[PDB]
Amino acid sequence: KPNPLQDANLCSRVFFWWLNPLFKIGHKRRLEEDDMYSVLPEDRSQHLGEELQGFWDKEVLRAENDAQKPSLTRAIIKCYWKSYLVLGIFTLIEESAKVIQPIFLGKIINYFENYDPMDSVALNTAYAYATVLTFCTLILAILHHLYFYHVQCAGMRLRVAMCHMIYRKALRLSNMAMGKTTTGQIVNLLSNDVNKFDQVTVFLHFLWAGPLQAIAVTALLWMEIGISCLAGMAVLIILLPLQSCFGKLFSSLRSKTATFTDARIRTMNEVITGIRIIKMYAWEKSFSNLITNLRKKEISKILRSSCLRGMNLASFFSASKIIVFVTFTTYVLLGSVITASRVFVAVTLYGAVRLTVTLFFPSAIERVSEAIVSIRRIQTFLLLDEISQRNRQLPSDGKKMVHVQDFTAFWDKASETPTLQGLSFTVRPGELLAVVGPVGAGKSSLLSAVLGELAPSHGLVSVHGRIAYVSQQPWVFSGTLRSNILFGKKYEKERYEKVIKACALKKDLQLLEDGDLTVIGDRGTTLSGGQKARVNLARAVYQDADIYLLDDPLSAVDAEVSRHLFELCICQILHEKITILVTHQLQYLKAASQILILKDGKMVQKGTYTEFLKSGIDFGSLLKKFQAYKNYFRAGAHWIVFIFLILLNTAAQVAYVLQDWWLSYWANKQSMLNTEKLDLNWYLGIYSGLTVATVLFGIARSLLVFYVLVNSSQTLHNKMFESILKAPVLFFDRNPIGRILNRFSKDIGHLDDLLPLTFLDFIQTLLQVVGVVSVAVAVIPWIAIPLVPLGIIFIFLRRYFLETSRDVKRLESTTRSPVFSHLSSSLQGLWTIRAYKAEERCQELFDAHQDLHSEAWFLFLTTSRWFAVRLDAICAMFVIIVAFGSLILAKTLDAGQVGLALSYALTLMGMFQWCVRQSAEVENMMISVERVIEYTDLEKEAPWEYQKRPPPAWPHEGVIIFDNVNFMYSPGGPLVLKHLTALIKSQEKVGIVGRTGAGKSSLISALFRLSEPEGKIWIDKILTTEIGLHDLRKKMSIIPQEPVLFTGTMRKNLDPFNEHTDEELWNALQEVQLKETIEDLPGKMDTELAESGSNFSVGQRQLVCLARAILRKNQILIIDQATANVDPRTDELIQKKIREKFAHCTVLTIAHRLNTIIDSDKIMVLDSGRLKEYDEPYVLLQNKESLFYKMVQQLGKAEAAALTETAKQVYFKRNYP
C-alpha cells in the first residue's frame, strides 16, 4: 500500500492534494482496511517504539548513574524536543501574523472612517490593504493547518511509540509484576491513558506563544490606544492564574475521578465475566448497588470536573468581551473617545489573544496536567519487576536436557515457606517424567521453574532446547482453531491430521459446522473444558519442540479421552522427545519412564513406578491428607430545559455580538458629532450591561450544557446497566465479555467527559459562526447572494468528505480493538509466549496491529486536515467577500459597520472548520450512543419476581421433577436436551454423568432458566416459569465448574447483601476449614482479594461457594465438576463434608471422576443430550452393556473392580440394613 505522501511535493502536501484519490474511492464504495495507505516507514510502530525506548533506556541508565534520581518518562522530552520545536515555527509565524493583520483591519476601516468620496487613490490603497489582509488570512489558515496537522501527527508518534513500548514491557514483566497489576490495568494504560498523548502536543507551543503574543498585543495596542490597553491586558493577566487553577484543579478532579472510574470498570468486569455465577446466586441486586455507588460517587466528580470546563470555556468565550470592556471603559473614562478603528483593531487583537492566552494556553496547561498523570503511571508500569532477561546461553554440548539442582524458589519472597525446596532431577531425550502430588504442591510451579518463570532462590536450572508448554489452565485465544493449533507455525496437512487424531479432536471437529476452521470465541466460551484442554495440548504438540512441559492436560477430560491422550498423544509423539508431565491421574504412573513426587515443595521420592511399588507406598495414601439525538437529549433533562438551553445559548451569542455592535454604534454616533458631547453614562451603562449579559450567559450556557449532557450519561448508564443486569444469559454467551465491558468503559466514558465537552464546543462555535454570518448579512445584505453558492459548495464538501470520513473513522474505531485484543490475549498466555522464544514474533504481530491502526489514524488525521483546509478556503472566500464587498459597496457602509463585519469575518477563519469538523465528530461519538442505547432496550430476561411469591419456607421438601423438558440455547437453536422426564425425591443425591457434551451442565442451565425451557419443571409442585427468577435462584445453591471469587472483602464473597452476622461467617469458614487460612492474613474479613484467582489454591474456593450455600441454606445444591483439578485430598474432603452437611439437601453432582459419584443415590446417564439410564449405580454396573460400566472399565481393571464393590456395598447397605 504505497502512501502518496512520500510521492507528494510540498505544494500538494500543504493542501493535502495527494489525498484526493482516496476520497474519489470512498465517495462511491465502502472503505475497508485494504483501501488505507501503509504508514510512512519513518512512523511505523516499530521505529517509533525503538526510538523512544532507546531514549527511555538511556534515561533509566542516567537515573542510576552518578545521579540516583528516580527515572522520568516525562524527561523523554529529550526524544521529541528536536522534532517538536520545528513545529514552533508555524506557531511563531501564525501568532505573529494574527497581530499583523489587525493593523490592516484598522487601515481598511480607516478608509470609511475618513470618508469614501470620489478619491481613486484612497480606494486603491484600501484595495491594496484588503488584498494584503486576504493573503494574510490565507497564509494564516495554512500555518494554522500545517501546524495543527503536524502537531497531531507528532502526538500520534508519541502515542504509538508509548503503546509499542508498553507492550514491549508487558511482554517482559515477571510474575511479581503481573501480580501487582492486571490485564485490565495494562489495557487501561494502552487504551485510556496513552490517548492523552494524542492531545498533549496539540496546544503545547501556545504555552509560550500564549503570553508572548499577549505582550505583543499590548506592544501594538498601546501604540493605538495608550495606557488604557494595560487595563485590558491587566484583566488578561488575571485570567492566566485563574484559568490555570481551572486546568490543574480540573486535572486533579480528573485523576481523582479516574480511580472511581476504574473501580467501577473493574466491578463491571466482575459482573460481565461471572454473570452466570451472579444470576445463579441471585447477586444481581448486590452489584446493582456497587456500580450505582461507584457511579453516583463518580457523577459527583464529573459534575465538578465538567462544571469546571464550563467555567473554562465560558472564560474563553467571554474572555475578550471582558478584555475589550475593561479596555474601553478605561479608554473613555480617561477622556478619549471611540472611533471605529481604534476600537475594532483592539477587538480583533484581543480576539487573537483570547484564542491563545485564554483557550490554547489553559488547554495546554490542562493537557499537560492530564498527560503528566498518564506519564507518571506509565513510568510506574515501565519500572515494574521485569522477568530476568534469560542468562546468556552458555556453549552447549548439543545434548538437549533439563537439569535441576537443589532448586529453591518463592512465588512471593515474603512468604516464609518456599514454594519449592531442594528439587533435583535430570531429564534426557526419550524420557517421560511424570510429576505427581497433592493440590498446591507446586507441580505447575515446577514446570514454571523449568520455564524460568520461577526465579530460583537457591539451586540451578539448565535447560537447552525448544520448549512447548501446556498450561494447567488451557489458553484459548481469538482466531480459528487451526490457527490456534498453529500458533504462528506453518500449516502442514499430514502432521496436523496426525496430531488432531492423536489429540482426539477429529470427532469434535466433525460435529462442528465449520470443523477446524470454526472461529473460537473469546476465552473459549464456544468450547467445553475438555475441548479447551485438547486445543491447548494440540497447540503445544504442533510446534514439534524438544522439551514438553505438560501441565495435566488430562484433568479436564473424561476417562476414555484421557486414556486416549496418554496413549496416542503422549506415549507416541512424545516417545522420543524430552517430556515432563504433571498428573493427578495415578493410572498413568505405570507407563511413566520416570516419576517425581512433590508435596509441599518436598521432592518426596524420585524413581520409576516399579521402585515405588517395591517400597510398598500406596499412592492413594500419598495423595490423601435524529431519533438518537432525541433519545440522548431527552435522557438528560426535560425538553423544557432544552428550550431554556437554546434560549440561553442564543442569548449569549446575541449579547456577544451585541457588544461588538454596540461599540460599532457608539463609534458611528461619535463620528456624526459636532459644544456637543456623548452621554457617557448611558453608553458605558449599555456597554457594561451587554458585557455582563455576555459573561453571565456564557457561564450559564457552558454549565447548563454540561449539566444536561452529563445528566444523560448518568441516565443512559443507569438505564443500560439495569438492562444488562437483566439480559438473559444467552446475551452473554453470544456477545463476549469484552464487547459488553467496552460499552461500559469506552462508550460511557465518551458520554461522561468527552461528548458533553465536544457537544458544548460544537454548539458554541456553531453559534459563533452563526453570529459572524449574521453580522456580515445584517451589515452587507448583498452578501446573502454569494453566500448561497458559498454554502452550497460547503454542502457538497460536507457530503463528499463524509462519504469517506464516515469510513476512515470506522476503520480506526474497528482496528483499534485488534491492538487491545492482542494485548489481552498475548498477556493471558504470557508464560507460554516466553516459553517459546517467541517474544520477537509477538512483537512483530503487535507492531503490525499498531501499524494498521496507525494507517487508520493517519487517514483520519489527513482526511480531517483535508476537510479543514478546504473549509478554510471557503471561509477565506467569505472573508474576501466581506472585505471587498465593503469596498465596492463603500458608499453604503458606515465606518463602524465595516469594522464590525470585517472583525467578525476575520474571526470566522479557523473557527468555521472547528464547528464543521466537530459536527462530523459529534455524530461520530453519537454512534457510541446508539451503542449505549442498544443495551437499554435489550430483550430483558423473565420478570425477576412475580407478585405471587412462593411460600417463605419453600421449597421445604426439595423434590425436582422433569416433564418433557427440552433445552435449546437459543430459540430454534440445536436441541441440547430432548424430552426429559425424571424425578428426584427429597434429599436424594443423584449424580449426572456422560461424555464431554452429554447435556450435563445444560440440565443445570435449564434448572436455573438460563435459557427458558419448554416443558414442566416442578419444585414442590411449583412450576419454574410461574415463579420469579430471584425467588427461584436464591433457592438453589450451585458450585459451578470454575468458582469465582469477586474482588473485595471475603465478606462480600460470602455475603455482600449482609443478611447474616459475623458468627455465621466464621462458622462457615470453620466448616470449610478456611478460617485458619484467611485469619493468618491481616484482613480476616477484609483481605484485599485481588482478582483472577492466581493467589489461591485451585481446590479451596469451591468451599467458599458451599459456605455461600451454608449462609443461604438451600435444600437443593447443584455441583458442576467441582473437584476436577484437585487431588484425592480435597476430592474427598468436599464430598464428605457435603454428606455431613447436605445430607438433608438434595445434591445434584456432575463430574467425570467416578470415585466422587459411586455412592450417589441415583445416576442420570446422559448421552448426546438424552437421558439413557436412570437407576442406582450398582444396577447400572449390573448391566454389562451399560455405558456407565464401560466408563468404569475404561479406567483400568483393578480400579473398575474397586468401583464395582464400592457401588455394590453402597447399594446393599442402603437397601438391606
Ligand SMILES: Nc1ncnc2c1ncn2[C@@H]1O[C@H](COP(=O)(O)OP(=O)(O)OP(=O)(O)O)[C@@H](O)[C@H]1O
Ligand atoms: N502466582 C502464583 N501462581 C501459582 N501458584 C502460586 C502463585 N502464588 C502463590 N502460589 C502458590 O502456589 C500454590 C498453588 O499452586 P501449586 O503450584 O501448588 O499447584 P500444583 O501443585 O501444580 O497443583 P494444584 O494447583 O492443582 O493443586 C499455593 O501454595 C499458592 O500459595
Ligand SMILES: Nc1ncnc2c1ncn2[C@@H]1O[C@H](COP(=O)(O)OP(=O)(O)OP(=O)(O)O)[C@@H](O)[C@H]1O
Ligand atoms: N457457551 C456455549 N454456548 C452454546 N453452546 C455451548 C456453549 N458451551 C458448550 N456448548 C455446547 O452445548 C453442549 C452441551 O454442553 P453441556 O451443558 O452438556 O456441557 P457438559 O457436558 O457439562 O461439559 P463437560 O462434559 O465438559 O462438563 C456441548 O456439546 C457444547 O458443545
Ligand SMILES: CCCCC[C@H](O)/C=C/[C@@H]1[C@@H](C/C=C/CCCC(=O)O)[C@H]2CO[C@@H]1C2
Ligand atoms: C478543552 C479544549 C477544547 C476545545 C479546544 C479545541 O480543541 C481547539 C483546538 C484547535 C481549534 C481552534 C479553534 C478555534 C476556536 C475553538 C472553540 C473552542 O474550542 O471552543 C481547531 C484548530 O486546531 C484545533 C482544532
Ligand SMILES: [Mg+2]
Ligand atoms: Mg497443577
Ligand SMILES: [Mg+2]
Ligand atoms: Mg460441563
